[PDB]
């Protein structure tokens, strides 16, 4: 077959599709879905319909930030 790109990857949710159309058709919905999410991610900027999901996301996508950083301390707000 043809070697090169494997498949497209969405940034909104993180889906993957082979055909370009799919992505577009899969994004058109995001434009309306964005409304649902009310609690944004102060870590990356994402958004969720609720905080419960925003807190866990940081443990799956930002699981390397929550933990103590390198020797060099930093300003933590809590």
Residues of this chain that interact with Zn ion (CB under 5 A) are 10, 12-13, 15, 41, 43-44, 46
CB of 3 to Zn ion, least distance (A): 26
Cα 23 to Cα 50: distance, rounded to the nearest angstrom: 25
Given the complex with Zn ion, which of 12 and 37 has the nearer CB atom? Answer: 12
Cα 61 to Cα 22: distance, rounded to the nearest angstrom: 25
Given the complex with Zn ion, which of 11 and 71 has the nearer CB atom? Answer: 11
Given the complex with Zn ion, which of 25 and 43 has the nearer CB atom? Answer: 43
CB of 40 to Zn ion, least distance (A): 9
CB of 2 to Zn ion, least distance (A): 25
Q: Got the DSSP string for 12-61?
A: SS--EESSHHHHHHHHHHHHHHTTT--EE-TTT--EESSHHHHHHHHHHT
């Amino acid at each position: 077959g043809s070697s090169g790109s494997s498949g497209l990857q969405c940034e909104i949710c993180g889906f993957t599709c082979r055909q370009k159309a799919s992505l577009n058709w899969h994004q058109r919905k995001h434009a309306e879905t964005v409304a649902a999410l009310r609690f944004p991610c102060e870590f990356c900027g994402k958004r969720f319909e609720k905080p419960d999901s925003v807190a866990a996301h940081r443990s799956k996508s930002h699981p390397a930030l929550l933990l103590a950083p390198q020797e060099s301390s930093g300003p933590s707000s809590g």
